[PDB]
Amino acid sequence: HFRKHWQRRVRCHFDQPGKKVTRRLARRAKAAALAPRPVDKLRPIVRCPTVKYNRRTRLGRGFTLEELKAAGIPRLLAPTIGIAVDHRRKNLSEESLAANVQRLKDYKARLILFPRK
Amino acid sequence: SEKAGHQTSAESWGTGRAVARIPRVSGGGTHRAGQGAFGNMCRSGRMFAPTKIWRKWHVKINQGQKRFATASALAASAVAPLLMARGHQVSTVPEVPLVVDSAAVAGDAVAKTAAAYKLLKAIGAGPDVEKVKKSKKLRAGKGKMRGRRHRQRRGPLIVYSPEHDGKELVKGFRNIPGVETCPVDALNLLQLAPGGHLGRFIVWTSAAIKQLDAVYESKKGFFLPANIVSQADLSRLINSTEIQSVLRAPKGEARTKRAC
Amino acid sequence: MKVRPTVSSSRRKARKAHFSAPSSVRRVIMSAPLSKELREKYNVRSIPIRKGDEVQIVRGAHKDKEGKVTSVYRLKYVIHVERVTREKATGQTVPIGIHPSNVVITKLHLDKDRENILARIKAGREQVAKAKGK
Amino acid sequence: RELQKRKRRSSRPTIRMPNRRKKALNPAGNNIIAKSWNKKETLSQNYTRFGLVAKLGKATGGTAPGNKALLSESDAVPQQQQQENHIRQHDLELESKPEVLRALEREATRPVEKTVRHQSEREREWLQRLVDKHGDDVAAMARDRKLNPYQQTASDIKRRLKKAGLL
RNA sequence: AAACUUUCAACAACGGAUCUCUUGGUUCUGGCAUCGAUGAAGAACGCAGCGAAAUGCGAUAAGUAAUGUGAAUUGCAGAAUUCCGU
RNA sequence: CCCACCCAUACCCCGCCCUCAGGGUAGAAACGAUGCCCUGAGGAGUAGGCGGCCGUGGAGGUCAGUGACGAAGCCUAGGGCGUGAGCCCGGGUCGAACGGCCUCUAGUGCAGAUCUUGGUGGUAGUAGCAAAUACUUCAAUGAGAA
RNA sequence: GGGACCGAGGACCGCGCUCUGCAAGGAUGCUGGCGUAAUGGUCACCAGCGACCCGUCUUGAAACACGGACCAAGGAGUCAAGGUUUUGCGCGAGUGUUUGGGUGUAAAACCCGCACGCGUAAAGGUGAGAGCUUCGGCGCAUCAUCGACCGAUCCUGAUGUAUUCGGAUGGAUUUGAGUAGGAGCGUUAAGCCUUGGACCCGAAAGAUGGUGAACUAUGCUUGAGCAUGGGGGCGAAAG
RNA sequence: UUGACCUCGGAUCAGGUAGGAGGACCCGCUGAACUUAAGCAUAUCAAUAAGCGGAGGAAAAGAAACCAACAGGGAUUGCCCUAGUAACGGCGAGUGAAGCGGCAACAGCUCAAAUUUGAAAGCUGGCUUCGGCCCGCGUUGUAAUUUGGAGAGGAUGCUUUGGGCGAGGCUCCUUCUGAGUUCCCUGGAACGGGACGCCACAGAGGGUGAGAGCCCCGUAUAGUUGGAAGCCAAGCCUGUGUAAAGCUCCUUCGACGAGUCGAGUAGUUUGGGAAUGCUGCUCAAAAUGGGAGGUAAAUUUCUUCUAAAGCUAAAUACCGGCCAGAGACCGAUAGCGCACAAGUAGAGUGAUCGAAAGAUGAAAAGCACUUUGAAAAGAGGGUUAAAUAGCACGUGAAAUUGUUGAAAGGGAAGCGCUUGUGACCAGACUUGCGCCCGGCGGAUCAUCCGGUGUUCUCACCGGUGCACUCCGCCGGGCUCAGGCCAG
């Protein structure tokens, strides 16, 4: 499959050790700004779509509105305390709901909050 | 450069004139004009098969084979003949694994470089740190012009425990020529077998010998390999009472007398 | 060995910088050790040379020859010393070049900036000795 | 290329750019994290000392040993077991350890300032005029039109009276 | 017998190979984001005692102001110009 | 028809080299079992196939390697080693670095390509004084001064 | 009896004989000569015999054709991706750390969380046969011969059937890359194949975008253009 | 007659802006041939190169008219895998995705559709005593409120605030911070060799008259002096208006983008005739609407999103810009065309084409002075360690050439084998051991003494002596073994 000019469009990766240093420095640079906070926001536990991966389970994008209200976290506060929020996702079953309001309840137990001023 | 030898406007003179059909540059007012171009035969041309970035520079080696090779280099370092076959002046140390007390290396005790020198002389590493100092020699060849100006030997490799000794010992040994420092969790084959030759002189510490069982247990996907030979002394296999009792009588001698 | 990334271990960049240096940083390169008496009094090891410095040549074919600096030629990294000269073919006596690293300064040419140089080296040398001692 | 050869031959000096970064790598200030952050240990190593979590996702690789940073029902209700329609909207009513974590807990639990808002001077005059006519009858005060131009319910007036100390 | 030609050796030429060198190139990686009608990039004309197939500068013309350093520049002429000093 | 003589890389005996084959070699050998010893047979060669070995640039280890009391290079009607590619030494020159071994690596080995670039010949002090340019000298055109 | 060429091996061991030692599994004894030269090397020259162009490329033939003035330096099967065969190596029904994360003495080394690629998974007789043996016999791998089971289609046509559906049982003179007690994954090295400039040099063409298109007269059209492609000029080829 | 409003113009009126460069990477437009298919036209080449337009430090994309058929996922982008699979194919050449999954990075929003109508609450300019005054825009709509997994309005009760200074800290530049020029030898010169030291969080690198950790610059580490601009910020002054904000509840409401979908047709393009997408032409929509899927399952049952308006960091690219660090790279016919006067010199009408050329010495000490004579030249003499290093300059190969010496030859000779002669060069076994006698001296001798180290029975020193023993040395005597070639 070398019918076209593959010479002009070949990309090597000698920056693979150098990009890893930059990526680890970006995580250190981010943690200097958000010094007591974790680097990454909290994400929900969701089930993979297809029949091939139904039995597996991964992290989603953000918590549903019903999950936040059941846990006791107000919607407009959640992005400001490290909880990602997805308005598109729906619950559609009690098993998806109960797994995530356990996760948010477990987040609140391990969370320490500091007053505003 | 991908454009080396291609920055010319040369056309062949064809079958007309009595010249070799090699592309010759146009123009008529310069010494360049009329000269051959665009060929490996030609001065200021392009070389055959120009070197490319996408040559295979790095080699993938299986992790099991890397840990096998590290296990063999560690075992060869516990053998006293293999130390002196590797060029180490090892005739003064009183035990060939040479485990030093961690209380003599832990913390600020070796953090000064003068104190690190005194410890090596006491335990018997003195001839080895003097061997590398006296072997300072300019490099034979054109690598001098490329940042590689001197060649010296290798000295003892100090192996320590970062959990129980700290990293202050690294700074004390850093200036002493030849001697190298390596944690017990991150052993390196390029340091254990320099040049592919086995038998590095290693100055262990007492905290590292305790950890050596643990670090080789924690390696997942790998176990200490079983040898295909249990008794590697072949003279014991052959000159044993059990083997020699069953043999046939010798059919001849080592030298055979000429019959006719 | 070198640690800081701004430092370069290139022979090419070092040789370019030495031989294409400005005269301000040629002055620091063109520096000489002080005598044993001057070391034990100013607590200073090495200062750059200026014109008025009485000096003593301790390396080369003109060893153990003492004199005053006549010229600090920074373009060829040369100092000139009184009565250290050779004759041309014509008989005209020309100064002989000694590098500043081949001489030891016996007497300084002291002005206000020179005492400030000597104070700053003594302040740093005293500070680290105190920091190492206690 | 042809630009770079001009600067090699020119007498103009090279302009050496200092090694600057858009984002600082190490935290600074007088707070708890900045006064206990080690310059030479990683993010995971520093948060392990603090007792805090750095990454909330799942592990993308093997971590070093010692790291703690990268981590009766009548109606059939799947939420009854996880219990403990209006909620507080601005804060969260919440319930051997490292020194940094114990120091941060003293910052969280530290008592705060109330900073009570006050009624404006004309607002007190509007309310005092209402007491001076109707006394404590909140129904007539809401139903009054001259002294209550912006027509407010008795429930709003009663709250403003109780704040101003006029019952 | 001279000469002429050939081979070899010593010495002397021609030529610039070989060895050594390298303020050059090539390739990789990293930090950063900045030309122009407030006249850019480029093209000329000029400015130094002897100067270019250089470099700097613009009638304030191998430069002025300001800050720092602290005693030069240098191929030759030449400067009562500056050394406890804006 | 008879007798005697001459010589092939052929045949016979001997020596030596190599290949192949058979045998021996451990309570180890009077030599790296990848060693050593004994015996036999065989030896042409294009395309082609396989094995070993020599040499060049650079990299890791090593020789406690060589070197301004002279490294590398080069020259040489000298002493050697190898079947060979090659390797060592002497004499002269010269003036700053270089080599042996085990591995690694490659822009790695030339008599040709009407090969490339450079340098230099015969033709030949010949054909020639045509173009081309080198130096000297001479004319004019326009200015001067003695 | 006369002569020539040769002396391999290196304690003893054997076969023997004419047995106090021999000519019997390979040369010792005695005498002489040798450092102002024993014995070699290089160059030059004479002499006897032999041969007297190299690389390519054809031929029954090179006595064909091509290349060669000389010397120095340069100069041509390489590197990627993908197949395949064999050797070495690790692990093994599994194997592959290196997209990425952690860590570091910082492009090295060391560590691995979930996936993913490929693969595996979703016991018969007889006779030979290496090896062993209580000498009675066991019998690897592999081959051959008859069996066993899975699927297929055919006919035979059970309990049954929704009453028009069924395939059970019995056989095939059939099939498969069928099963019958795994062998693969990763890597290093070598050879071959495909595609890239593809061992090095060498067409005529085609396309894209630009630069130039000298002079003369006349006529036509809307200062410019067109034409007489006219009149002159350049090149070609016939020794 | 006057004065509006609209529309179109003038002005060397005031305030602004665009052009050009660069273009490695980025976004559009336009668009070719050779080649392959051993011929060639569909196809490939290639949605490439050339041409045109437009940006930035990134750009572009981007918060579903999405993927899916699930127990569901949930903006965009990039890596691995999917996978040389699906799909389309003169079914030849070949071309060639995507969803799922593991990662990297993560961030959400602004309008139009409403009546502020109990008060255009908004904004550009000008004059300004900087404090607040005028003109104009604008109702053909500028603020606030809202943007469909929403919202509005009431009611009810809890929960939230706003400005200004600002010590100090981070980033980056700067100042200073270790130790031999100790003795001897070679050398023109120690930076080499030998002896004795010292520093080392510094034995990276460069210079210095030859290989320098300690002669010089630097290098390592924490500090330390001064400064620049951004950002953060302990605290400290003030706040305020019946001002704004979030949730709850509901006998009240809830507006969502048109010459756009779509139908036919032509061109283009894609793996993709629900056209895969786009564009042109003709016609031209809807509101329990529209789009894309799923399904033989018995009728289009169900599933999932809302198009025709807009913004937005990060993970990604990078032959260019400002710098910086590197290398199993090249080493002056190499490496960029250019290590140096290099896009220079030179050529062409022009577009364009485009070279050759590095090295004295440690230091010019770059040859004074005498004497030839017309010269880029000699002979003396001098500098230098060296001038057979003299700006023709490190070393200085071969082709080729001259002089001197030997020998040969007359269309010879050259190469192979074998002697001979001459010239030059070399120089054979490196040439030793063993006994006896006398003397001298040390020991490993002495059951001598003392000490040290050790592997704990072996070594080494110091002092004693010559009864024995053994080594040497000196002076005599004797014997043996010796390399090669002949007979």
mmCIF file of N, CA and C (backbone and C1' of nucleotides) in Angstrom, chain H residues 150-164:
data_model
loop_
_atom_site.group_PDB
_atom_site.id
_atom_site.type_symbol
_atom_site.label_atom_id
_atom_site.label_comp_id
_atom_site.label_asym_id
_atom_site.label_seq_id
_atom_site.Cartn_x
_atom_site.Cartn_y
_atom_site.Cartn_z
ATOM 1 P P A H 150 -33.888 19.998 32.818
ATOM 2 O "O5'" A H 150 -35.075 20.836 32.177
ATOM 3 C "C5'" A H 150 -35.339 22.164 32.593
ATOM 4 C "C4'" A H 150 -34.653 23.155 31.694
ATOM 5 C "C3'" A H 150 -34.842 24.619 32.029
ATOM 6 O "O3'" A H 150 -34.032 25.066 33.101
ATOM 7 C "C1'" A H 150 -35.193 24.308 29.737
ATOM 8 P P G H 151 -34.705 25.683 34.422
ATOM 9 O "O5'" G H 151 -35.452 26.988 33.904
ATOM 10 C "C5'" G H 151 -34.739 28.050 33.292
ATOM 11 C "C4'" G H 151 -35.633 28.880 32.408
ATOM 12 C "C3'" G H 151 -36.645 29.770 33.107
ATOM 13 O "O3'" G H 151 -36.091 30.974 33.603
ATOM 14 C "C1'" G H 151 -37.723 28.595 31.392
ATOM 15 P P A H 152 -36.667 31.636 34.945
ATOM 16 O "O5'" A H 152 -37.997 32.363 34.481
ATOM 17 C "C5'" A H 152 -37.988 33.338 33.453
ATOM 18 C "C4'" A H 152 -39.393 33.689 33.056
ATOM 19 C "C3'" A H 152 -40.256 34.255 34.163
ATOM 20 O "O3'" A H 152 -40.042 35.642 34.338
ATOM 21 C "C1'" A H 152 -41.447 32.579 33.002
ATOM 22 P P G H 153 -40.037 36.289 35.803
ATOM 23 O "O5'" G H 153 -41.553 36.200 36.250
ATOM 24 C "C5'" G H 153 -42.570 36.842 35.503
ATOM 25 C "C4'" G H 153 -43.920 36.465 36.035
ATOM 26 C "C3'" G H 153 -44.028 36.541 37.539
ATOM 27 O "O3'" G H 153 -44.261 37.867 37.961
ATOM 28 C "C1'" G H 153 -44.947 34.502 36.781
ATOM 29 P P G H 154 -44.191 38.241 39.506
ATOM 30 O "O5'" G H 154 -45.628 37.821 40.030
ATOM 31 C "C5'" G H 154 -45.880 37.666 41.408
ATOM 32 C "C4'" G H 154 -46.926 36.617 41.669
ATOM 33 C "C3'" G H 154 -46.884 36.039 43.065
ATOM 34 O "O3'" G H 154 -47.617 36.838 43.964
ATOM 35 C "C1'" G H 154 -46.970 34.284 41.495
ATOM 36 P P A H 155 -46.920 37.415 45.276
ATOM 37 O "O5'" A H 155 -46.964 36.175 46.259
ATOM 38 C "C5'" A H 155 -48.189 35.503 46.483
ATOM 39 C "C4'" A H 155 -47.964 34.111 46.992
ATOM 40 C "C3'" A H 155 -47.013 33.985 48.161
ATOM 41 O "O3'" A H 155 -47.627 34.295 49.397
ATOM 42 C "C1'" A H 155 -46.528 32.330 46.547
ATOM 43 P P U H 156 -46.780 34.986 50.566
ATOM 44 O "O5'" U H 156 -45.847 33.815 51.096
ATOM 45 C "C5'" U H 156 -46.407 32.677 51.730
ATOM 46 C "C4'" U H 156 -45.429 31.533 51.801
ATOM 47 C "C3'" U H 156 -44.114 31.819 52.494
ATOM 48 O "O3'" U H 156 -44.200 31.817 53.903
ATOM 49 C "C1'" U H 156 -43.702 30.675 50.479
ATOM 50 P P G H 157 -43.368 32.903 54.735
ATOM 51 O "O5'" G H 157 -41.971 32.200 54.987
ATOM 52 C "C5'" G H 157 -41.902 30.922 55.582
ATOM 53 C "C4'" G H 157 -40.593 30.263 55.257
ATOM 54 C "C3'" G H 157 -39.346 31.013 55.692
ATOM 55 O "O3'" G H 157 -39.024 30.751 57.050
ATOM 56 C "C1'" G H 157 -39.100 30.149 53.478
ATOM 57 P P C H 158 -37.706 31.358 57.742
ATOM 58 O "O5'" C H 158 -36.583 30.264 57.478
ATOM 59 C "C5'" C H 158 -35.237 30.653 57.257
ATOM 60 C "C4'" C H 158 -34.516 29.676 56.364
ATOM 61 C "C3'" C H 158 -33.124 30.080 55.922
ATOM 62 O "O3'" C H 158 -32.135 29.851 56.905
ATOM 63 C "C1'" C H 158 -34.332 29.276 54.065
ATOM 64 P P U H 159 -30.869 30.827 57.023
ATOM 65 O "O5'" U H 159 -30.084 30.606 55.664
ATOM 66 C "C5'" U H 159 -29.321 29.432 55.463
ATOM 67 C "C4'" U H 159 -28.858 29.323 54.036
ATOM 68 C "C3'" U H 159 -27.911 30.404 53.558
ATOM 69 O "O3'" U H 159 -26.573 30.179 53.955
ATOM 70 C "C1'" U H 159 -29.598 30.067 51.946
ATOM 71 P P U H 160 -25.520 31.384 53.933
ATOM 72 O "O5'" U H 160 -25.181 31.573 52.396
ATOM 73 C "C5'" U H 160 -24.118 32.411 51.997
ATOM 74 C "C4'" U H 160 -24.243 32.828 50.560
ATOM 75 C "C3'" U H 160 -23.769 34.233 50.260
ATOM 76 O "O3'" U H 160 -22.369 34.294 50.110
ATOM 77 C "C1'" U H 160 -25.828 33.811 49.164
ATOM 78 P P U H 161 -21.477 34.858 51.303
ATOM 79 O "O5'" U H 161 -20.552 35.936 50.598
ATOM 80 C "C5'" U H 161 -21.034 37.252 50.372
ATOM 81 C "C4'" U H 161 -21.217 37.542 48.906
ATOM 82 C "C3'" U H 161 -20.804 38.945 48.499
ATOM 83 O "O3'" U H 161 -20.376 38.928 47.145
ATOM 84 C "C1'" U H 161 -23.123 38.688 48.158
ATOM 85 P P G H 162 -18.863 39.302 46.791
ATOM 86 O "O5'" G H 162 -19.005 40.470 45.729
ATOM 87 C "C5'" G H 162 -20.283 40.862 45.259
ATOM 88 C "C4'" G H 162 -20.381 42.358 45.167
ATOM 89 C "C3'" G H 162 -19.066 43.085 44.991
ATOM 90 O "O3'" G H 162 -18.601 43.041 43.659
ATOM 91 C "C1'" G H 162 -20.338 44.169 46.644
ATOM 92 P P G H 163 -17.046 43.254 43.353
ATOM 93 O "O5'" G H 163 -16.897 44.830 43.306
ATOM 94 C "C5'" G H 163 -15.615 45.422 43.279
ATOM 95 C "C4'" G H 163 -15.633 46.813 43.846
ATOM 96 C "C3'" G H 163 -14.273 47.361 44.206
ATOM 97 O "O3'" G H 163 -13.595 47.871 43.080
ATOM 98 C "C1'" G H 163 -15.756 47.741 45.992
ATOM 99 P P G H 164 -12.118 47.356 42.737
ATOM 100 O "O5'" G H 164 -11.197 48.279 43.641
ATOM 101 C "C5'" G H 164 -11.485 49.659 43.776
ATOM 102 C "C4'" G H 164 -10.750 50.246 44.945
ATOM 103 C "C3'" G H 164 -9.339 49.741 45.124
ATOM 104 O "O3'" G H 164 -8.441 50.375 44.237
ATOM 105 C "C1'" G H 164 -10.446 49.750 47.207
#
